[PDB]
Design a protein around this ligand. Structure first.
Ligand SMILES: [Ca+2]
Ligand SMILES: [Ca+2]
Ligand SMILES: [Ca+2]
Ligand SMILES: [Ca+2]
Ligand SMILES: [Ca+2]
Ligand SMILES: [Ca+2]
Ligand SMILES: [Ca+2]
Ligand SMILES: [Ca+2]
Ligand SMILES: [Ca+2]
Ligand SMILES: [Ca+2]
Ligand SMILES: [Ca+2]
Ligand SMILES: [Ca+2]
Ligand SMILES: [K+]
Ligand SMILES: [K+]
Ligand SMILES: [K+]
Ligand SMILES: [K+]
Ligand SMILES: [Mg+2]
Ligand SMILES: [Mg+2]
Ligand SMILES: [Mg+2]
Ligand SMILES: [Mg+2]
Ligand code: NA
Ligand code: NA
Ligand code: NA
Ligand code: NA
Lengths: 506, 506, 506, 506
């Protein structure tokens, strides 16, 4: 039957369904079963009111418990190509306790499973046990952790918020892995320029057990069994073609400039915030500063951080500045040097995160106050965490929408891992401090003002500094273009254009 | 379809429906749609039990969410002449979070809206964001704030409670704005005396963008496009007539007396009480005193007030006296100099206001205790905030009813703004410290004992001190008369009669 | 229609219905309507499972709100002979807030009411306001207060618990008031001995406005309009008969002995416990002691007592001894001088009384522990408050049942006041410190060992010390006999017999 | 009708039904009635989804209250052979309050009861009152207390966890009591070897009132009326046969070695944990140590222990070491000398035990952390309490399953006591510090390496040290064998085999 089975119901369900319908469109639609401990008629009424085009995919609703075999058989658990275990809204520990029981129940199905299980986890500290019992069947996506990592990357490089929104999920272009036997024996540097409608980003190496290698060496020779990872518009829109001849050349300014220290403000004590501090410390230049403004008394912060595993005496690049106050009170915020921050993250505070409507209400209040304080004393990059995807969609035609990053990104990640489990490893690397990550790079590294050249020609220059070029954003365009059309056509570039690459760090 | 759409359900719904039915009576009835996340049959049963005459208006109930387009279309959202977003009973922040999402949902309706949106807000600090996202579509009525402002005005001038109850809502007389081309070129001083059945209070000035000017200069010449604001019995009961000839004269005692300091007691720590203190400080004579009796420790009060934006070192007219205790405990209240207060406001305390039945129970207890303490030590104007309109109506044949001001006034304000959005600006000015407000004035300013004259004759005397005369209360009448009949008829007035005017301050 | 209407639903409803069915049996049954905000079919199912004989009374159930006129008319509110407003189980203030709204709703019925309203109040401090708004329509029965007063009387005189249980409610004998014109002109001393099947206890005096005078002077001459209060088996079982001739005589030991001091223990901090302390102080001999064992810190007790209106420096007869601890912890109870108490009251503590099952569980635990501590250190009168009548009935064949006084007594009081509102004044006096009360008296006051005489003969001796004799308990009988049969028959009495009288104090 | 009646619904119901179906299988099935205050159709749907073979037993569901006679008659309460009163999940005191009311209701059934009542109690301190009111009808099983006692025995002797799981409940072998007249006059030492398919463990002695004597003297002569207690596979699988001739001999190493001190860690403050400390102190060798790691401040622990009746100055064998911290925080656990503990019990903490899913989630976290801390610092017997039987079953194919003891054992105990009430006394003795208990004993006490002999021959050697031999575990077997087949067959034993006996202590 090879349908997608979703176990549970949450605020993320509608956007997850949408993503799966987009992914299935190239098939002419598929089948999604949703099983939840709710009345079947209510579920059907709610699905019937969703406002997105199902694109030929049909959704079936059943009432039942994922711990009850009789209920799992109502939805053909053992024939599904993927099973997605949705987190419950609310308390992260309760949700993760249910996730663990569900995974145990699924691993107990005696007929076995055809597909893999994608588990939406809410707290990183609960992941090890779920992975331990789920073995080779389970992929975990730790939603809270992912969102923190994305907020940091977008704080560091603002234009990335639009790029990540484009790449995640199934609108526009995303990652695909597929076997191309006619490419065996090719060097990766030729594979790179072999697909008119795609960009190769890495290789699934068969002699490594199927391990995905992002940004491999140009001299890697594809072996029998290897597959190519690409960015492409859909699973069936791209294929290799005879090699174009691409003019070669040199980089004009292949330099590394000393990265400048950054000053970042975290508003709110986010659950597990030490995990963000660790990521930040491994991402910023030395002598950077992290300001934490929140209502936890300073005396007690060190205890919270050390119990979550952070040694604040071994931080390498950031110093911590603590300030105490209420992020919705004007008078407390105005004592901050707001104008001095390179970026400000407004985080859902651990004391209210169990109610998305209350957390989101506070984050939006804080946003407005910060803007107004600054405006009123004037004779900045702000990112706000939003927990309910419906509130993000509701904001979409508001200016405020530029200042928000939502759990819709979690639904997009869940759908990608549901469609190909190995994409979890790709996104894990790109979200991690180690290994490859996305960067927006000035044009004067790659070309001189007005130089007439093709996307492929820039791509080969970018390989001299060990980057995979995936797109660009022209000087006065509002959106970057990922996986551009007509990669052999030439144009005159500007030093105000910028390029999007996959690269290792310094 | 041009019906009124009400989104939500609350303790105020019945009185709002009543007001809209009164407003619609002159049409022979209209249509009200009510959509709420409740069972349709329950809604219909509850509506069917309301005890007021629907006067030809028909009410339709639908079950649905205002965030769900499919549900908004069930009630013809885009054809309604007005949409009213009712606050949820309970916690003000939760209610305002829902109001914001609803406004975003409504502004997303792609067919657009024919009418405006009236949003019942529960907390002033949440208003800016709703106004920001609702743009030109939204009028906000901040219920909590309005009630505080009305309680202060009635504490300052007790007879105003009956006048405001009369003017608000659609029983008796209220404000109407309408275009009268045959009055172009007239001076406002002639317009004032041109309507046998109405009193002009201001002009919508077309050269100002449609801005409403209350109490304009007598020499203002009405221009093409201007409209007249009046107090009248209904939208269709009044029209201009040939000018009466009105005898002119002088004021006998056009004096200003030094306003005397007042001593006011606030019982309870009302949410956002600094907003009332600000209003009070701009309303009382110098060397006045505000006593605050409530259970918040004195040490901590200053912090609450400064965080809500009140600088208590810049108060101009009042000194603050703090007393700590429980307003339902006899022994604590009896240490207050109760007999010395010009007025006492019993306020719904922020610690219980999320339960109207609990708040109202405490306010009534405090009322009884204050009366009894004073009576028992005897060998005063009290105003009590009541949150459930049903409790006010239940009290109506009790003596206690003179001591109460309720959220029914909010339903009356919501209906007025629903019927003409520009009435929000009129009421905002009259509730504000700035600009015009209502005053009850002694007769010896305007006339001598037994002087025989008409209402219009007094009105023109009142214009010499830049007042609009809207009514009077005779010496032994229990009710003031607003917009009196037969304004040209003469009678003999008494120095114990009083007059109701719209005026600027000192 | 002259039915009983009960508004609400509670743990007391079944026992109230039972009492009304008993009261109605002599009519051949009546009608009770019950209206509650519950599903009608559930109500009917619950009524159908009650285990007591309805004795020809029919019960009708309707679903509705007592605040909604349409609902009050479903149950013929204006034709009922009585309306009983049942308290809600749980928090006393919430229940009393609902009682007040209900009374206002009932006083608003424009057709008026045929009968009176009996209001079950939960907190004495809320009674004044309900009485103020209910005027002449309302009788209040303050359940919590009544139970405290009964527990004290039974602690002082243990045999009274059985007597009060007999007299309250409609099993056995109770109070009736009725007009007997053929008795006009009789002296009260002859009226006393005029009813073979009843005992006159007082007169409703028409020249006093219908005021009930308990235990009037023997020389009072019944005037036209007066009615007689009696204890009798039912409203129709008694009538006056020609005067018997009763031998007169003297009292052998008409003495007053010095009342001995008592030591009483209160376990638990009962809500409003200062009201019990006041009653106790006016009831005990001088140099008595009240021990209060409970978890409130001693420092804070004085504040609680003074805020409830008790001045502990003006106590006349008792000294207060405070001990702090947990009444369910053996080790804390064993530090008390348990063997020294004349009586011990186990009270439902204010911290758990909102859950009757939790309060009753603690009171029974404490009971068991006190018994066991004493038994285990041995090489006492205990009274335990029980809040759910079902738990009292469940205990009935247990020995523990002698140690319990329950809210069933409240249902019995409510039914008595429902049947004749003037019985509220009778019970108020008998429960009050002032005026008449019930006493169990040794036989040697009235007679010598083996003296052969009739009940009437003892009754006339008792009048020489201004007592109304209502019954007796023979030397080895387990139950007292109230309103005995055959009052003229003689028997030989024992100095170990005891007599039950109504009397004023010392 | 002689069915089993179960009153209530809980997380234990499915496993209790399973056990009763196993017990009934030898009859061809029986009848179980389940009555709960739930909708009948929901109950039936849930029963219909249980995954275990009902083996011919039929289950009937009814909706009703055990306090309501009409409801008790729907399920033929007075004809049931047993009534089981299931605890409610959640708060132990609430559950026990309901148990007490139910027992009173059952003892009030005027037709009487045919069978006994088994009451699942949640707190030991509540047991006395239930036993007091239930008299001879009631058997109590205090679930919390039993589980603590089993965890201690399994900590002391790890192989016992598998043995107890085998013996409890009705899979494999369990206890049966039955009268065998043909054995009157036999010595108990011959009775011991008289049943090919059973092992006699004791005698119900008729001259003692039916008291069960475990491990009686070999010289006891069975008298008329006595019955034999055995371990056997089912009630009908065993019978006596002519005496086998068993070779006699001596024990080679009938020694007692000095028991070595043990170091035990308790993680979590379990409700009533003083009851476990008492058991532990009477079970361990002198100079043993009990470490308690939990979040209760050390200052306050002594108060908790003394109020629960533990005098820590009279402990005979253990010293207490207190450590404060959070058992789910790695950094706190790693300060413990984890490698030094003979066993570690992870206990459901009293602060979360009212939610089984939250308690079990913490216990599993702690388990994982302890393992990982030890593994990571390496250049142990752990027992974890699990409150929901479904979580134990879900863990069953996980390695983690060796580290868990669950409330399924309570369902097994309830079913055993339901089937024969006298088994409660047998298990009470075996769980108690006093009297007989189970022990795993080295082979070199009983035999020499390679000695060829039968199970009966070892059994008679074991009687010389006053042990009843019930089974063995061979050197490389994963499971012990209880009540072995073919007890007269010989084999060659190894010094690495071990024997399971019932014995008194030192
Ligand atoms: Ca696709
Ligand atoms: Ca965590
Ligand atoms: Ca795509
Ligand atoms: Ca109108
Ligand atoms: Ca506010
Ligand atoms: Ca009107
Ligand atoms: Ca009667
Ligand atoms: Ca009180
Ligand atoms: Ca009677
Ligand atoms: Ca069997
Ligand atoms: Ca306990
Ligand atoms: Ca078995
Ligand atoms: K994409
Ligand atoms: K009006
Ligand atoms: K009676
Ligand atoms: K077994
Ligand atoms: Mg962590
Ligand atoms: Mg403010
Ligand atoms: Mg009081
Ligand atoms: Mg104990
Ligand atoms: Na990376
Ligand atoms: Na104003
Ligand atoms: Na009295
Ligand atoms: Na034992």
């Amino acid at each position: 039957q090879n349908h997608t089975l979703i176990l549970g119901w949450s605020d993320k369900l509608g956007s997850l369904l949408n993503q799966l319908a987009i992914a299935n469109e190239s098939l002419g639609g598929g089948t999604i079963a949703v099983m939840a401990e709710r009345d079947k008629e209510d579920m059907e009424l709610d699905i019937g009111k969703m406002e997105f085009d199902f694109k030929g995919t049909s959704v079936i609703c059943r009432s039942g418990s994922p711990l009850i075999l009789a209920d799992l058989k109502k939805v053909s658990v053992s024939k599904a190509r993927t099973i997605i275990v949705l987190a419950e809204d609310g308390n992260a520990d309760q949700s993760d306790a249910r996730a663990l029981r569900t995974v145990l129940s699924l691993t107990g199905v005696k007929e076995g499973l055809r597909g893999h299980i994608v588990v939406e986890m809410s707290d990183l500290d609960n992941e090890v046990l779920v992975k331990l019992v789920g073995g080779d069947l389970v992929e975990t996506v730790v939603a809270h952790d992912v969102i923190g990592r994305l907020m940091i990357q977008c704080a560091r490089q603002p234009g990335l918020a639009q790029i990540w929104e484009d790449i995640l999920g199934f609108e526009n272009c995303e990652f695909y892995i597929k076997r191309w036997p006619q490419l065996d024996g090719m060097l990766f540097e030729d594979v790179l320029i072999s697909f008119p409608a795609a960009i190769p980003c890495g290789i699934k190496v068969a002699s490594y057990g199927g391990k995905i290698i992002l940004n491999p060496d140009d001299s890697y020779v594809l072996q029998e069994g290897d597959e190519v990872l690409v960015i492409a518009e859909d699973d069936d829109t791209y294929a290799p073609a005879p090699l174009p001849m691409v003019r070669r050349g040199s980089l004009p300014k292949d330099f590394v400039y000393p990265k400048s220290p950054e000053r970042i403000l975290f508003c709110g004590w986010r659950r597990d915030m030490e995990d963000m501090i660790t990521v930040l410390d491994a991402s910023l230049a030395p002598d950077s500063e992290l300001w934490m403004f929140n209502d936890v008394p300073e005396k007690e912060r060190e205890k919270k951080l050390i119990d979550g595993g952070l040694d604040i005496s071994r931080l390498e690049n950031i110093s911590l500045v603590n300030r105490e106050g209420n992020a919705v009170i004007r008078r407390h915020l105005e004592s901050l040097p707001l104008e001095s921050f390179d970026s400000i993250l407004i985080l859902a505070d651990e004391s209210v995160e169990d109610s998305a409507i209350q957390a989101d209400s506070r984050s939006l209040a804080t946003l407005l106050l910060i803007r107004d304080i600054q405006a009123r004393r004037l004779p900045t990059v702000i990112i706000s965490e939003i927990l309910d995807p419906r509130t993000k969609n509701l904001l979409s035609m508001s200016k405020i929408s530029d200042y928000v990053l939502s759990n819709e990104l979690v639904s997009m990640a869940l759908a990608m891992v549901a469609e190909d489990r190995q994409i979890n490893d790709v996104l894990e690397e790109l979200f991690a401090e180690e290994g490859n990550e996305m960067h927006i790079r000035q044009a004067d590294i790659y070309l001189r003002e007005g130089e007439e050249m093709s996307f492929y020609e820039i791509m080969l220059r970018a390989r001299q500094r060990r980057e995979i070029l995936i797109g660009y954003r022209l000087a006065n365009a509002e959106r970057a273009v990922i996986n551009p059309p007509a990669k052999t056509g030439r144009r005159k570039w500007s030093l105000k254009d910028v390029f999007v690459v996959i690269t290792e760090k310094e």
